[PDB]
Amino acid sequence: HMDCHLSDMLQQLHSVNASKPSERGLVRQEEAEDPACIPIFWVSKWVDYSDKYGLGYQLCDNSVGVLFNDSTRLILYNDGDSLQYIERDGTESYLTVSSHPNSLMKKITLLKYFRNYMSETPREGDELARLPYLRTWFRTRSAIILHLSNGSVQINFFQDHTKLILCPLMAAVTYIDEKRDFRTYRLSLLEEYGCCKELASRLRYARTMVDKLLSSR
Numbered sequence: 591h592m593d594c595h596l597s598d599m600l601q602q603l604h605s606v607n608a609s610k611p612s613e614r615g616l617v618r619q620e621e622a623e624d625p626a627c628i629p630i631f632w633v634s635k636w637v638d639y640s641d642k643y644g645l646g647y648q649l650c651d652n653s654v655g656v657l658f659n660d661s662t663r664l665i666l667y668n669d670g671d672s673l674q675y676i677e678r679d680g681t682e683s684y685l686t687v688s689s690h691p692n693s694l695m696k697k698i699t700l701l702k703y704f705r706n707y708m709s710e711t712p713r714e715g716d717e718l719a720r721l722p723y724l725r726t727w728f729r730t731r732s733a734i735i736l737h738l739s740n741g742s743v744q745i746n747f748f749q750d751h752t753k754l755i756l757c758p759l760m761a762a763v764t765y766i767d768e769k770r771d772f773r774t775y776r777l778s779l780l781e782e783y784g785c786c787k788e789l790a791s792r793l794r795y796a797r798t799m800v801d802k803l804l805s806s807r
């Protein structure tokens with residue numbers, strides 16, 4: 591095996607859910623907000639063509655990746671040129687679009703079409719590489735579940751277009767609501783101060799989704 595970050599996340603979710611944080615005489619959800627736990631990376635767009643090629647995604651920094659159906663991964667860094675390719679074993683190989691690798695043209699070509707299908711820059715100084723990639727994903731009737739290589743799990747809920755970003759290193763959750771406002775909470779402080787029924791319900795769903803990620807392994 592079980593991934594250690596997913597195991598930690600499962601325990602954190604078990605603890606907050608066991609406190610029944612919405613079933614309280616006094617709910618003070620704002621006191622659990624902690625902007626120091628803000629996620630640096632989240633998935634801003636995705637496109638599911640896994641029936642034929644794979645799942646495309648774009649991160650907040652405008653890098654794009656495709657997780658292909660062979661469990662290999664090709665990422666185009668936000669500079670438009672630098673490529674990271676991850677094998678099924680996890681071995682990482684760094685290339686450029688300028689240099690031409692024949693064994694990867696088809697995947698490189700697909701990545702460009704996926705990028706443009708999702709499309710309608712350095713978002714900060716330096717910060718090259720150490721970019722997370724999509725480890726695995728699955729979808730249900732109500733959500734898509736995205737597990738990133740930095741241990742974060744993002745759950746996008748189709749119906750109301752809300753999102754949860756769970757970070758096990760900081761034991762935090764960021765909730766993006768239908769208005770698209772984002773707020774970051776420490777899970778332990780949600781236990782202490784309570785939260786609304788909606789967030790409590792999504793955290794129960796999240797734990798069920800993390801169980802799935804761990805059972806699939």
Ligand SMILES: O=c1c2sc(Cl)cc2n2c(=S)[nH]nc2n1CC1CC1
Pocket residue numbers: 628629630631632755764766770771772
């Ligand atoms: O603009 C965003 C948005 S918009 C939605 Cl939705 C989620 C996020 N987000 C997370 S999550 N972490 N950081 C961000 N930022 C960056 C701004 C603080 C500088």
